[PDB]
Amino acid sequence: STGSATTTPIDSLDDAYITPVQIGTPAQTLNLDFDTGSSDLWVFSSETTASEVDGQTIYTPSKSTTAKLLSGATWSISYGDGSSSSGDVYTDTVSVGGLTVTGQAVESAKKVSSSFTEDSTIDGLLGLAFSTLNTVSPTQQKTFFDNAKASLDSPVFTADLGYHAPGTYNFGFIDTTAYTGSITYTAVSTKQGFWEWTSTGYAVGSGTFKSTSIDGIADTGTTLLYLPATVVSAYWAQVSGAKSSSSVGGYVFPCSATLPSFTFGVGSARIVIPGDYIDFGPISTGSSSCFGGIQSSAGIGINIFGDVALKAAFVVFNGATTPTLGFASK
C-alpha cells in the first residue's frame, strides 16, 4: 500500500504545516501537524476542556463506530517550545492520503497548553519519530508509520515541504519526479528516539564550505533551524545590523536586509537554503526588526534541522531495519 497527502502552511510565514487526517467511522477529518520529532498522535476532542478549545476541529469518539477506549491508558507530553497536552486514549481507524491503519492509538486531549488553544489551525499532532518516545502509559503505543510499515510497498515516508506553498507527505514510495539529481543517504542514530544524523558541514552565502560534523535531528515539527552558536554567529555576521536580542529571544535583523543563503552538507552532497527561507518577518506587527530563521541551539541540548532546512530538500525517512535519512535537492 501507499498514501499521499498534501501538507499546507498554516500561515504566511510557514510557522507549521497541516495535513488532513481521517479518523473514525464515519471519517472525522482533522488537520494535524506531522511531527518527525515526536511520537504521539493526539487530537483536540470532545473531552478537551471547553475553555481550551478555540476554533479547532475536534474528534468525538462517541460518534465513531470503530472507536474503542484503550482502558487505563493515559498520555502526557511536553514539547521543546514549552507547550504540552495530556489525556486518555482510544484506538480507531486512521487514514492519511488513502493509507489506512486500523487500531491506531488516537490520544484524546483532556488538557492542552495555551499555545495549542491559541492556534486554531492545528487540530493535533501526528508523531513520526520512533515509537520508543511515545508517551502512552502503562502500555506504550506505536506511531502511525510504525503500524503501517509492514503493509507499505517500501518501509519509508517522505517529506516535501513547500516554501510559502503546499507540499506533500508520501508513505510507502519515493516519487522520483519530486526531486532533482540523486538522493544522498546518511546514517541515523535512533538512540534518542529521533531521526538523528550528522551533517558534514556548512557554508554561508557564496562562502567556502566548512567541513565539520553537526549532529542533529530532522524535525518537521520545529519551525526553524537550530545550530551551534559558532555556526549561527558566522551566518548572521554576514547580515548588516543583525544581532542576538535577549529580549526578543534570538537573532533579529533589519527587515530591509537581503539575506544570504545557507548550505548544509549531507555526505558529499549539499542542500542550499535560499536566503528568503530564513526571513520570519517582523518581530511584532509593523516593526522593522525581523526574526531570523537560523537560531542557536545552545540552550536546547540538540541541533534541530527544522522546517527552514527541510523545506529546501526532498527528505526520505527510511524505516528499514537499519533506518537512514535521504536528502535531495528539488
UniProtKB/Swiss-Prot annotation:
Its EC number is 3.4.23.22. It comes from the Eukaryota. GO terms for molecular function: aspartic-type endopeptidase activity. Residues 17-328 form the Peptidase A1 domain. Disulfide bonds join 255-290. The active site is at residues 35, 199. Keywords: Aspartyl protease, Disulfide bond, Hydrolase, Protease, Signal, Zymogen. GO terms for biological process: proteolysis. It catalyses: Hydrolysis of proteins with specificity similar to that of pepsin A, prefers hydrophobic residues at P1 and P1', but does not cleave 14-Ala-|-Leu-15 in the B chain of insulin or Z-Glu-Tyr. Clots milk. It is an enzyme of class 3 (hydrolase). Belongs to the peptidase A1 family. This is Endothiapepsin. It comes from Cryphonectria parasitica. The chain holds residues 90 to 419 of 419 of the full protein.
